[PDB]
Amino acid sequence: VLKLPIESIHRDKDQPRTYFDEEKLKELSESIKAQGVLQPILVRKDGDGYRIIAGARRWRASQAAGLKEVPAIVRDVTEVQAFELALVENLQRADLNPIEEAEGYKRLVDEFKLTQEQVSVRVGKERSTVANALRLLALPTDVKGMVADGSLSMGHARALLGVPRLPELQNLAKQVADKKLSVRDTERLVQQSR
Amino acid sequence: VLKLPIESIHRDKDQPRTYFDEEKLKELSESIKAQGVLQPILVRKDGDGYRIIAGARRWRASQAAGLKEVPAIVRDVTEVQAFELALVENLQRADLNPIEEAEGYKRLVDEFKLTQEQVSVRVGKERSTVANALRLLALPTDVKGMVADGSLSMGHARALLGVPRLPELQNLAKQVADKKLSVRDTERLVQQSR
Ligand SMILES: Nc1ccn([C@@H]2O[C@H](COP(=O)(O)OP(=O)(O)O)[C@@H](O)[C@H]2O)c(=O)n1
Ligand SMILES: Nc1ccn([C@@H]2O[C@H](COP(=O)(O)OP(=O)(O)O)[C@@H](O)[C@H]2O)c(=O)n1
Ligand SMILES: [Mg+2]
Numbered sequence A, B: 001v002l003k004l005p006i007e008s009i010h011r012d013k014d015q016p017r018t019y020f021d022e023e024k025l026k027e028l029s030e031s032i033k034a035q036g037v038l039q040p041i042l043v044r045k046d047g048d049g050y051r052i053i054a055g056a057r058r059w060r061a062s063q064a065a066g067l068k069e070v071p072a073i074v075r076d077v078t079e080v081q082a083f084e085l086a087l088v089e090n091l092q093r094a095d096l097n098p099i100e101e102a103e104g105y106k107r108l109v110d111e112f113k114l115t116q117e118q119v120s121v122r123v124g125k126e127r128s129t130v131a132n133a134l135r136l137l138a139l140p141t142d143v144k145g146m147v148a149d150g151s152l153s154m155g156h157a158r159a160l161l162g163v164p165r166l167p168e169l170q171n172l173a174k175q176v177a178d179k180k181l182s183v184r185d186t187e188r189l190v191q192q193s194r
């Protein structure tokens, strides 16, 4: 694994990704300041330096963070194979579900004795994201199960935390998931439970 | 570039991820048979070998594909930092939207002259996934824009391809997105437009 001078790397004009969410890029950059770039970018020799195969976000985020080098693997590949590698890198991934994410933050706090502030800084996420994820874990087992398997979104879950009675919360959760009610619909029903 | 014997690596029992979707794992394995493991797994020295920091799916999928070794980067880190790295690796990523994915497949076919079969094999995706993604691109610009920004899911879009009249298709797409109609609701609506 090389450390390539950041100035020697330029973008792939044939890149599959067009839009770069600004906030997500900033979060990536914060994680880089905390941990460095964990996974080397893939590049190929091109012109006066290297062109990205896979790693445009790591590259841009490293630039924003003011790094002088980025870890890199130099691949000797054709143009068609470079494009296949870019797609494979992006598409062959499975995200943690919201409960797995929440439990991750909880382990850093409970087992490793980090504050929520430190979690936020060390992983590169907003304080609200960390706080909200942690509040999900107060929900009953069946409801967390619905958040985990994606039958309830994070939005749905945030609303349901306002139901005072645990029996009633669980019944409402089932209804929202079963009828596939929108997040706004769910908010209204919680206020009635009061 | 370090290649560790696959049997010398064992799982972190404090890993943040418990459940592995079987089909996603098979897809990962097929991509590995086609391209190898592109991003080295992160490990630390542990007992008589190495424990995964990040890369349990790559490891399992490499096993399933019958590889004898996996590329790895050996980190000397604390247990708390290892756990932070695992979360960062998983959480600090942005997926291609369904249109970007579809356009990727289309470039391999149109520019690089692969068949759909070869795309499927070389990227590790099911034939149905590739075929369905490609069919999305026949939709009008405004509707693709809604699939790209997530106002319409892939399911919604698949239904809308059956609308014969282009004016009617576009109006219906806007209505589905605006009223946040379910996929089943949308199917019914398409049938009486024939
Ligand atoms: N043939 C392949 C396919 C995916 N990958 C990478 O493997 C990682 C998979 O991420 P993941 O969160 O689903 O699974 P893990 O292997 O990190 O446990 C991504 O960084 C993909 O870019 C690879 O290195 N080689
Ligand atoms: N501090 C960090 C944060 C994320 N990553 C990795 O950077 C990749 C981000 O994937 P991405 O598809 O969002 O963007 P690219 O950098 O691949 O263009 C993931 O493989 C993350 O695990 C890293 O190597 N170091
Ligand atoms: Mg990428």
Ligand SMILES: [Mg+2]
Pocket: B054, B055, B056, B089, B090
């Ligand atoms: Mg991972």
